[PDB]
Design a binder for this molecule. Structure first.
Ligand code: ZN
Ligand code: ZN
Ligand code: ZN
Ligand code: ZN
Lengths: 199, 196, 198, 198
């Protein structure tokens, strides 16, 4: 059973979050109870602050609180390569990857013909003007039929502009053995094999 | 990440249990696409939970009233107290609708190894509720600690004219013996019941 | 995979549950790497089980003799019979050391939805064992079917005169009511054992 | 558990990779309700596989014949030799279908420090196979030693007359970068194939 509406209210809102079911929401409400008021406030404020300060970048649509995203601003960043991505989280992933100092672009999603979701529900337009010649457009969308489809659509679109278009490497992940690697992956890791030495 | 709004929100979510760095970020970005209302409703529910929930003076169960629902209910059985480890168990024994007595929440459990003795236990409020003609049910967990907590309570509550009982160790609903530790099955036998 | 023998091992292994196509293969490549004695000692172990194992004609527990270990042990409470579903059950309750009586292995539970009635479980050879002055401990599982079977066995056995018990429902050792479902906690609270007079 | 045959069979089964004590006991009781024919057909496949399966003297795949159907099949690419760690890897690439070439089974990876130099693998009998006009595709995993063994084979083959290639390190099929390892994403970006030149 559940009575104090405040507790019933917290369980609900918490349970509305991804990766957190009813049982876990309650587990969470009873932990917030044991916490000092300073924290609850700081959690609440942090939530509210961000919701206010956080907006999408006008150039690329990476998340920020300024006129331009830190990536767009930063002058030491390779201004000639744009890495198209599905979600702002991928920017972090490809950023904490210590191997890319270029510009990013965020379609806030993936194409999907099924649900009438087209290149108008995704930030594909604001990308075109950013693409010029002597530039490279790395397509880093997912690898689901969605990511695969979005990318090929992007390739088609960007083609007329004079930039080099590339797609990230389909392949076996690091720290695995062929035995537990999916069939279609292997076939791609194979057909996409890199030559380490030419006689 | 760079904007303080994000970093701070992450920071504050990292704290919450069942959530680490990566989840916090995931969460934040999820909250980013929610309409303000959703956020406001989450912020208030937190604050309203803090401002309103408090321990029941009589049983220490979490409530918003001067007395918890169980305690303010006159149709409840005043002659039995089911001592439990966490407030979440009162919910669990209540969803059972099989119990109409009273509870009592220790907000913890004896943990010698982790330096937890009775000092950190809160029984002060329990003692003055157990007289004679009453039954106390130790619905403490069944771990090495729970069983301890019960033992502690037994020796503690027994001097009062109370009859102390313990939740039955047995096989759980939907259980298939083979997939049930021996010790438990051993108990499920010792405590079986005549159905004929 | 072309060598027919390799193929067969795969297919033969794929028949065992818990093991599937891709999993059979792995095992097969694991065997290939083992010495001849390992493989010969696994092979002979299968043929020896088949050849020497069979249900106890009295209680249907698994055994390699005319009557099972339990049934033949003189120092056993021939007064009580604990009924279980699978033979592995006798292993558990025995590995429990709390029981010193006899058993009866049904080899399954009643399952209406799967067309499994009493005729497909060794229920019949259990009736002639039950008489007045005995106790039948229905220790079938605690699932919906496991319960249904218990009830059924109870109605059948009752008139015979023996006393009948059901294993105690309850909280398992080493847990907390948090990660314990309500249903259980309900019976677990109801079947509480008094630990001290008033 | 007392019948020596049930025990002996559990022991032997629980030796198999993937099945634990519990799982093994379960397989035993399943073997129980099975007919001799199956038990003999299983025990048959085992001993049979031990008898007929051996390592091919060319590419060390697995076969009954004097030479693996792969090496034997004259309809395969005679120019490429795909080096894998395990025979399973063969069947693993012989699924994606995108390969008609030859293979070379190493039967393990390097991982030196724990005492496993190249002399314990089948690298030696690979050398003569490689020649000018061919391509050696190093298909070892991507574990630490997976990449290690590859880097060894590379340095080792360089001199021979064939080109060397390494399987593509990258993002698997059916995934989002959010749920994809750091270094993988990194090697994914560095190993990005351009698809539209300007
Ligand atoms: Zn930007
Ligand atoms: Zn109360
Ligand atoms: Zn017997
Ligand atoms: Zn061969």
């Amino acid at each position: 059973m559940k009575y104090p509406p405040s507790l019933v209210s917290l369980i609900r809102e918490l349970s509305r979050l991804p990766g957190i079911g009813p049982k876990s929401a309650q587990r969470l409400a009873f932990h917030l109870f044991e916490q000092p008021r300073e924290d609850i406030e700081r959690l609440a404020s942090a939530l509210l602050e961000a919701k206010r300060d956080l907006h999408v970048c006008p150039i690329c649509f990476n998340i920020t609180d300024a006129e331009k995203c830190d990536v767009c601003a930063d002058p030491s960043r390779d201004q000639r390569t744009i890495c198209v991505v599905e979600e702002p989280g991928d920017v972090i992933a490809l950023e904490r990857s210590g191997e890319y100092r270029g510009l990013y672009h965020v379609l806030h999603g993936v194409l999907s013909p099924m649900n009438g979701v087209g290149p108008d529900k995704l930030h594909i337009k604001p990308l075109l003007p950013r693409v010029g010649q002597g530039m490279e457009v790395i397509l880093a969308t997912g690898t689901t039929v969605e990511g695969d489809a979005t990318a090929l659509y992007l390739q088609r679109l960007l083609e007329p502009l004079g930039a080099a278009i590339s797609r990230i490497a389909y392949g076996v992940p690091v720290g695995g053995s062929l035995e537990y690697t999916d069939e279609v992956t292997l076939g791609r890791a194979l057909t996409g094999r890199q030559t380490v030495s030419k006689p």
